[PDB]
Each structure stands twice: as structure tokens, then as C-alpha cells.
Amino acid sequence: SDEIVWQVINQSFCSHRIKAPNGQNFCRNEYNVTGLCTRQSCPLANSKYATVKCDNGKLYLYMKTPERAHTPAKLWERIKLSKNYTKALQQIDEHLLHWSKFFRHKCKQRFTKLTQVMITERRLALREEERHYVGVAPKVKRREQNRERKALVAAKIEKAIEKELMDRLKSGA
Amino acid sequence: LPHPKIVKKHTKKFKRHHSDRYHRVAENWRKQKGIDSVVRRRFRGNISQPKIGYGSNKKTKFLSPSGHKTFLVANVKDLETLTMHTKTYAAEIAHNISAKNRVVILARAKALGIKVTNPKGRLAL
Amino acid sequence: NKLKRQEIFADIKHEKNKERHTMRRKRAKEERENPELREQRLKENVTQTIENTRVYEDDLMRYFNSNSNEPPKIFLTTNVNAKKSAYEFANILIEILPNVTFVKRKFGYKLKEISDICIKRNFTDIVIINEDKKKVTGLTFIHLPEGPTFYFKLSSFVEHGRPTSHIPELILNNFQTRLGQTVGRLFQSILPQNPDIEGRQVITLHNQRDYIFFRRHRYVFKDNERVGLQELGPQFTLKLKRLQRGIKEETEWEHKPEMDKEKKKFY
Amino acid sequence: NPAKSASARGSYLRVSFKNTRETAQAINGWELTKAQKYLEQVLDHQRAIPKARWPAKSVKFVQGLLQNAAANAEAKGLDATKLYVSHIQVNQAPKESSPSHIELVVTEKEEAVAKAA
Amino acid sequence: AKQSLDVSSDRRKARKAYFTAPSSQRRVLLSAPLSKELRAQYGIKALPIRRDDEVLVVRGSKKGQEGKISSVYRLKFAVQVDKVTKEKVNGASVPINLHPSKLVITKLHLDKDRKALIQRKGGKL
Amino acid sequence: MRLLVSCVDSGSIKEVLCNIGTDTSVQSALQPFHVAPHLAEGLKAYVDRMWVISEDEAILARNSGVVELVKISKHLKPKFDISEFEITSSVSDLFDDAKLESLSSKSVKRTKLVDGFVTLCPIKSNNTFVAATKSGLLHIIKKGEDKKLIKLASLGLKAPVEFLQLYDLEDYIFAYGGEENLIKLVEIDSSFQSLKQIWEAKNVKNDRLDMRVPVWPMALRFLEPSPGKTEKGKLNYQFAAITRWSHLTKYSTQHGRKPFAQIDLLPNREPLSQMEVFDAKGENVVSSLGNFQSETFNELNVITTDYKKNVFKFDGNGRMLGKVGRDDITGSSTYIHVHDGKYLLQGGLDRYVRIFDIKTNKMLVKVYVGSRINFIVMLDDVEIE
RNA sequence: AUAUUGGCGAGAGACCGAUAGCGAACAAGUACAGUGAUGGAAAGAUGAAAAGAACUUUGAAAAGAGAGUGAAAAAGUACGUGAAAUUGUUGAAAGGGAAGGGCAUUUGAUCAGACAUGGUGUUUUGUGCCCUCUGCUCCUUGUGGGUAGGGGAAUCUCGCAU
RNA sequence: CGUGGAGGUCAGUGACGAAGCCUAGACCGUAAGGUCGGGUCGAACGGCCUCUAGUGCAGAUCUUGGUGGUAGUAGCA
What we know:
The structure is cut from a larger assembly and holds chains A, B, C, D, E and F.
Chain B: E1 69-73, H1 76-79, E2 89-93, H2 99-112, E3 123-124
Parallel strand pairs in B: 1-2
Chain C: H1 2-33, H2 36-44, H3 58-63, E1 73-78, H4 84-96, E2 99-103, H5 112-120, E3 125-131, E4 136-143, E5 149-153, E6 169-173, H6 178-190, E7 201-206, E8 211-212, E9 216-222, E10 226-232, E11 238-241
Parallel strand pairs in C: 1-2, 1-3, 6-7
Antiparallel strand pairs in C: 3-4, 4-5, 5-11, 7-9, 8-11, 9-10
Chain E: H1 11-19, H2 23-29, E1 31-33, H3 36-42, E2 46-48, E3 54-57, E4 66-73, E5 78-87, E6 93-98, E7 103-107, H4 112-120
Antiparallel strand pairs in E: 1-2, 3-4, 3-7, 4-5, 5-6
The structure holds two RNA strands.
């Protein structure tokens, strides 16, 4: 059934859990609403399951019906969610008619955060940044240490200046 | 996040008895088992022992000074589990992750609004 | 078999030093009688250093680089959200460079928007210092019209001189390479072309590898063919990178670690 | 400054360690010409190493190293008159025997300065 | 996958067998592939290597350089290609020990038994 | 072989005379027979574009505004024959700096914003040439019967231009574009007075972020028109282009105004330039103007250059076909050209002439010039004894 | 059919990994000790390749100094990583017949301390997955999905850019 | 809570530096300990659900190896 699916993954392995040091459990099954995993908040244990995701900029809301327990190929039925926030939350509501109030406000909540992930464009229009992360590979860290120490030794700067002051002020006497 | 004022109870490390005198005795905590030990009978002046009373408040446990819970991350997949808990949890880029992969992780965590506890690790300019 | 190996080669090393130098004591004794025999040894037997074994216009002067016609104004800026050590570093460049203005850089004005200001205000060069952590790491000289731009890396700064207000004399070393003399060209341009002789201050720019060292000194002349000099100013090591050719759009050299593999070349 | 320095080193030397420590620190921070003259005086019982003693063998090793470091300095092309030992260090060696490593680093004493109004 | 009971998949047995192999077995273990031109002519992938045949080096620091094999050092599992030489500090020349898997034969040295070896393996000289 | 290397730091033409296997970097290797500086006119008047007409005649175009017809003549100086260069005619003052300085109020990044020639090619055995500038000017400079250059007509285009490519596949028409300027097809009349914009490109649909895709095409090459049933109204012109935003974009006008396939060649939107056309086997597959002679995009193979140090090779579907001279090229690449279909001409800001073989990806010639190259043309490849 | 710590020859392991495992991974039943029967250890790792440091110079020798090979000698036949005890040097601090510890704090030294930059509500425009015209394609129930050719902002914030 | 190995899993980490070692460095856990920064290094390693054991040291006039104070002392006939 599904209670038997839950208990077998609650303990006895949900092989995509992250045990945080906080003791918290995170299902990384790409189709869950809360990143955390709990009973009927993870998409395997529950049979009726809604979620908002993004594949491109297009934010779809996927939906899982218990009708399709036989066929995993077409489990998640998906609908595009316009682009304006107000009509999208209204778009959400109609799909969630006669469900748990869990998925009602939580898909509303997924959509909220994933729309304010499109603050990426804000970072990437006003980018123009003169920095960029450079790796410091420990081979280079010694090619540019032990060769400078070998430079100074062979340099003999004092003798170089002592030459090119005498050689200057003899010719510029 | 609006968090409560995090009380620590005991900031000092619970070192072992005679960990400082002898060198072979480690600073890692071990109880004194002997009946004639002053530390075991909790005499005045002697070192304080770890007991359950020093336990941290449940609401403010595991929280760093920033008010976030710590969370290890290996790659971009494990990072994107905290898409819903940016205010609560913080990405701790694991020690063994290369400099090549960190620039990728930091790009995504900056976009998702996830506070990384250890940026500038292996990364010069 | 380490226990065998250890004794065999320790004795062989012991045997070799005896033989090496008994040959040399006989060499010494034959050299006392005949000076000429020593001379021939020095011809054949060579020290063979790395320098010995190295693996091998006028319109430009004005158009890309600043000459002795104006006082060159240098727009000293810093990378965004920098701390004490960067401004501490700016105070060392506030003395050495001719007519520096320090600009506190407040987020935005990407790069071309800066160029618009320093056309209007009429600057010659831009210099920007950056910090990854609490240490200074990179230094970027750009020329404001056209844009020949040089990037640099600092791995040394250590701090008893205390100099005067007199303007220091330039000196450069080892720029045989054409890419070397285009960097020599930058430091001829960017530093003052005033030298007031009295005040006795010398700024060097020695480059025996691909590493360039700049130092300041005080020279005292005694008439017995010798000059003395005391350490003054900042200790320094630089590394050339990029040569971005446009303001920042193009490249000419851009250091990779694909060099260091040659152990020679030196650009 | 490594440019203003020369250094000799002796390793696995069959000397008494405890005697070498005393004659090393007796000569530490001294000008090279005064230093070499001092050890000649210790050999002839004119001066003693700091209670005081005349340890012939230990001093013999040290003035051998100082003679070597003098030639090391003239190999690089340093001034002989302004030369002084800055860092002289002596520590034990693998063993019974009681051998010792010695290393000494000689340095220029740079003054040479003027000013103008 | 191993099907036979005669052959062993043990690491310890296999490494010993290789390092304590005789000169005759090491002849077969030091086999070089042929270039695409010779593979088209002779209709054969790889052969054991000898002296008076030419070779082109594919992998290593001496990449793309070619020459003629001087001596098959079977003890050190190596070939020594003439004109692929590292110059010592005293002005002398020391040959680099290349491995025949990294090499590629460009011009074979056909003898009578060599012709018979090609004809055995399904060749057409 | 013999080369015309356009120098900018001196503002001249250096003439390379050498053999195959010439290397100036190695002292024990082969040397070039003769280097020859000609027409030193300073940094202010460097040669932008050229065209080799015949054995004893070649046109030039300088950045001061001057288009010059120059006579080549050979004489003796083992057994090699050096060239002499004499300016016969000159048509000057063909730039308009006022347009470009007014438009780019921070377009991207250029402080001086110099106007240069984007093309120099023949219209058709004609004695009739065209020259286009970055400020949208097009000058139809015809060589007269008395061997003197005369300007027939000056024409106007929407700025800013970066490339202009004529269409010489009969089966007059050209195309042009630049920064925030789409690819527009313009028909010229035989009188050379009338220009008519017959077609304009459309930018593709938005990316993930719903941002507008940047438009900055850098070079175009034409293909022979699409086969099958030609639709009425819709024109038949197959062509591809390269942008500054890594987009290898391919347009079939029969299909539509939008390009049917935009392909990111490199990640992170790396700037690219100079779309050349070659063939994998080292063959000539193009006309005199480099336009690909086929009715399909899948046969096309392209060479393009970035601004870091690299020279790339790509097919018709954006698959990476290997770099050209990864080791030797240390600086940028200002100019590339596929000569004969079996040689590559290369020389950039590292100030070296490089001649690469197309088939084996092998460097043949390396010549130090001492000046930044912006243009190279091969006169002949006949060996010298 | 059964036994088998020997021999001959294999195939294996939820075994041990150099103070373990046989005593012995190596000049091991060797070196060595005992009149003798017997007793019986220690000891693995340079590198990818010796490329094992040429040559100048300090010393009768012992070792150094310049210089070089190598990715690295910060890998040198005392050779991978190189812990602690312990030893020297340098720097800082403390010391009138005890130090180290716990609670608290001052002073001195010192390290942390955002490539954080918006958010909201209006207004120019300019684009698109927007309006509109014409379509094409995957499948399951309406509350579907993907994907072309044109036009059009004088309506429309629907989104994103200024 | 930790250690050696086993099954499973994380399409885990890893020459853009695994393991180890230090560190007047930082965080978490009452604690067993865990995590991270810096330095050194050079090739494998870890979390999670389970299995298994030659699994956790301050002592045994402990075993082995190394190193001190004693001491430049007694001493060298």
C-alpha cells in the first residue's frame, strides 16, 4: 500500500536521506515540496502528491495521482503556471481544490521561493564584476614560492644597483 | 531569522583531570573511576565535570552565532535540498571538495540565498 | 636491501671525497709552479648556470604610454569592500607615484562608467589594488585612453629607511625580451620622470627571472670605486599577467601554468 | 637578507656535544676578525671559554667552520672586515658515541648612510 | 568475467608472475601496436617489438617524436629508442626508458620468422 | 611561400619570404630568406583590409581614411625575387567618426571608438571594388581605365556595422550587422546608387531567465540556396553567422526570419570572432569571398577565434573539432584566413606569423615580425632554391 | 566410500598488513651466543625515469659553499608521509626558599568581522514564452504538455530588460 | 560516541590534492567526539541503513623501540 512503504523508508532505508547534524532528515527526491522529509511530505510514502518545479524558466506544477501506481512512466502530470504572480497563485488554487491544506499553501510556498530565485537575473544583469574565483593549486603555490627564493639569490640587487650607479654617474659626470 | 538569545551555559572545554600535568594523558574527557579521586567526589576548587544540566536549550540547539543550523554539502544536488530552509540552515562546504567544484557551489548558493559558513576556502582572486 | 645499501654507498661517498680532493691537492701544487695551467681549466670547465643556459615604435611611446610632456595623474582605486591593509598599501603608493588621487570605490559604475568619469576629469592611468583575504594580492595598471593594461601578483611585503620629499631616480634591469621592455615601458611611464639627483633616492625594478623586484635605496659615493646603500621603502615582488590590450577586452600573454614546465624562456 | 649572508655547516662530527655548545655561544654575535683571533688565544691559553676552560678539540672544529664560512663569503663576494656571525647553532646527532651537528651563518654589518636638507 | 577454473583472478599471484617472468614471456609482454597505415597493409593489430624497426612515440613527454629502437631492455620492461635521449649535465647522452604500449610501430623489420609470425596471425605481407 | 603581413605598430606591410618548415623562434632551424618593411606611415595610418587582384596589382585600405591602389614589381637581390610597392592612386576621407562617438554612450567598452574598414572585396574581371566602414558608410570605389581610383557612390547603412559579406553564388546582394544590429539583407542596383533592405532577421526566443538574448554578429558566410519547392514571398538565402556571445547561428530565409538553430559553441558566453570556412580533408570548397558552396549546413566546417589565446574548429552542429596550434599561440588572434582550402593564415597580438596545415593540424611557418598583425594574404606558395 | 599440519601442483578468504602475520616480506634458521645438545634476532618504501648532484670553491681527511637535475630534493642512496618524548637557536613572558589547576578580569601579543546592495509602489519605453493570425506534435480527461511561420503595441505590467 | 573489515546506498569526495600529520585558528555536541579554516603532504577515502570483531589504555618492579635528568659527574692504573 503506502503505510507499508512509509514504515520501510522511515527506518529500514529511504536511500536518499541526508541526516543533518541537527538530527533532521532531508529527502532529495527531486519531486518533494519541503526539502525536509516526513510522513506525507516526501513523495514516495504519500500517493497524492503535488509539487512546483522548474526545468527552464517555466515553472510547472507537477501532480501525482494514485490512479497511476501501476505506471511510473507518466506519474507526474504537469501544468505551466503563467508568469505573473497573482494569476499563478490563483492558477495554483484551482488545481489544489479538495486536497490537503498542506499542498495548498506549500505549493503556493514553493512557487513563491522559486520565483524569488529569479533574482539570479538581477545578479546576472548587474554582474560586470572584476574579480572571478581563482583556484590555488599547491603545485603552483611552490612554483611561485621556491622560484622567487631562487630568484633573489641569483638576483644580487645591491651589486646590480652598485654597477648601474657607477656606470651612470661616470657617463653623467 | 528572529532567533532567541542563544545561551551556552558552559563555553569552556571539559578537559580531563591531570591532562595538563602529564603529556600522555589526552585532553579528551574521561571520567575519574577511582573511589579516592577528588574530581569524582566533586571537591571545591577542582575541575568542573560534564553533566546533563549543561545541556543546551532545545529551541536554540545546534545553532551557530549567525542563528543558522550547520549542514554539510558535497555537491549542487545536496545543496538544493535547502531551497526551502535558507533562514534555518546554512551550507557548510565539505573539507575535501576541490577548488574546481567550490566555485560552482558558491555560484548556486548565492543565487538561492543560502548562507555558506565557509566561503573563501581554497579560493583566491 | 637497505642494510647492505646503506654501508656500500656511505663508503663509496667516503671513498669519492678522498679521491676527488687528493686529485685537487695535486692540482693545487702544479698550479703554484705554473699559473697558466689553471687558466685552461676555467675555459673548458664551465659553471653552467640557468642564465647561461636560457632557452633564448616612437609613435607608440606617446600613444599608449605617458611621456615627459604633462604631469601624469593616476586614479588610485581599490576593489570593493576592502579593509585596513589595502589602504595601508595605498599609503605606500601615495608617496611613490607622481600625482595620485585616492578614490573610495562605492559599488556599481561597472568599468566603462568609470572611464567616462576619468575622461571628463582627465586622468591618464587607473591603478586598482585587490584583496582576497587580509593580505594584498593583485595590482592592476591600466592606461585610460586606448587601454594597454597590465595585471600583477604580490607575494612579498616586509617592513627602517624613512625617506625625504625628494623625487626618486629610476633604474631597470634585464628586459632583453620585447614583452619585458613593454613592462619596462609601463614603469618608465607610470613613475615620475623628474629625478632631482640630490636627495639621493633610487627606485629599482630588477627582473632576472619572470619575477620583478622593486626596492628603494640611499647611495653614498666614496672616491675609491665603490658605493654604499641602505634599505628603504617597501619590499616587493611582482608577476606579470594578461596585457588585456583593450580597456579589458583582448589578451596578449596571460600566464598559464602550462608555463614553468620549460624551466626557462622568461618573458 | 640571504644576499648579505654566507653559511658553513658540519654534520655527524665526532666531537663532544656539551663542549661544542659552550664554545659556540662564547663566539655568538662577534665580528669575524675578532672571533678568529679569540680562538687562537684559547689555543695558546691566553683567554678561556666561559668557571672557564680551554677546550682545544671543540674550538678546532669551530675555527675550521669559521675559516670555511670566510671563504664562502668571499666566494659570493662579501666584505671581510664588516663580517660577523649572526646565527650559530649546535645540536645532537645520531648515536655509545655523542656526535653533533654545527651550523653557523655569517652576515655583513651594514651602516653606510647620509642625508640632505 | 572469469569462467575457467584454471585461470586465477588473484592480484598477488598475477603481480608475482609478471615481475618474475622469464625473458621469453617478457618478449610477448613487450608488444607494440602498429600504426593505422600498417594495420591497413598487413591486417594485424599488434606485434612483439625488436631492434632494427622504426617507431613513433604516442604518449609521454616525448610526444610525437619518432626513431628506431636501439635495444629492447627486457629486464626493465623497456625499449630504448635512438635519438630519443635525455642529455645529462656532463654533456653525455642517456636514453629514456619508454614502454612499448605507449609506442606505435611505423616501419617493421621483416625477417623470415617475422614474416611467418605475420602469416600465422592472419596477415598478408 | 610569399606573404603580405599588415603591420600596425609601424603602420606598414612586412613581406615574408620563406619555405615550409621555417621557424624564427629556434636558431638552429630554417630561416626566412627576406623580411621587407614597406610604406611606413605611422601608427595613426595602419592598413585595415587588403585585396590581391593579380600578379602585379593589390589594393589597400588604411585607418586614416585612405583607400590606395598599389603596384607590385619584382627584381633580384639564393636566386630570390623581392617586391617593390608604389602608390599609384589614393581615394581619401571615407570615415565618419561623428556617428560612432554619438551612438555608443557605453554600448559595451571602447574609449577611443575608432572607425575602421570592415570589408574590401570586388563586386564581380571588373576593376570595381567595395569598401564598408563601421559608421554605416559604403563606398563603391571603381578603378578607372587610366589605372586611377574614382568613387562612384557613397551609401548609407544602419550603424554599427562589424562585418559585411557579399553573395557571389549565381545559382547584387549582401548582408551586414553589428552590436544590437540584426542581420539585414540589402540589394544593390547596377547603377550603384540605390540600396533596398529586402529582409531583416529576428532575435530568438528568450533564455531560461527570460532575459533578451544579446545580438552582436561578428561574421557571416553564405551557402547555396535551399532545394525543393520555393515559397512565394519568402526569399531563398541560406547562411550562417557567429556572434560575440558564442552563438553559431544558422539562417534559412525559406524557413523564416528567426534562425532555425542558435548553438552556443563555448560555455559562459565567451566572445568569438572571424567565421572562416574549411574542409576536413584539406580541400577548396568556397568561392573567392569564402562563401561555402553547398545546399546543406551539415557539410559546413568553421574556424573561429576568441580573445584569450585560442583558435577553435566547429562543424555544422556546434561540436568541437579541436584547437589550432594550442602550444605555439600564446597571445590573441586578430586575423585568420583559410587560403586555398589547404592552408591557414594566422597572426595576432603576440606578433608572429603562423601558417598551419588544414589536414594534419601542423604548424609549418613561424616568422617574427615585431609588430601586431591585423591582416595576412598569401601571394604564392612556389618553393625557392 | 575413509584419514592427511608431510610432499608434489593448484584454486581461494567478511584472515594479518611490517612491535601484525611463520622465527624469517630484506646477505634468515642468516648474523651471533653456547665445550656441546641447542638457543637464536634486528632489518620493507628515493623517483616516473638515477635524471644519484657535472663543474667552480672551502679542507691531509671528515664534511660544507656556490651551481644544477626533477613535478617536488620542503624525495637525497642518514632517501614517501615524518607524530610524541627529548635537544639547540631565536622571539615573547615570568621568577624574594615550589610550579602546574578552577572561578573572574585587566594589560601585552594576536585572529576573526559581507565579490551583503536591496525591498516596495508608480512612470518612460524597448522586447519576449504577451495580444493577435496560421499551425504542428506527444499522449490521457481537463484544471493537459512540447514546439513553428507572420504581424502588433495607439492598452498593458503578462513577464523581463532600461 | 569511536576503530579494522563485509553487504547496501549516497550515478558521495578525490592530482583544481584522498588519507595522515601539526595549528597562539573557528564552530557544534553536557560528554564520548563530530565538523570546518590555515600550514604540511602525495593517493586513496568518507557519510548514511545494516553486518562482523584480534575494536577504545595511564598504570601491570607490563613488552618492544626511542629519549632525558643524573653529567661533561664517578671514571681512563
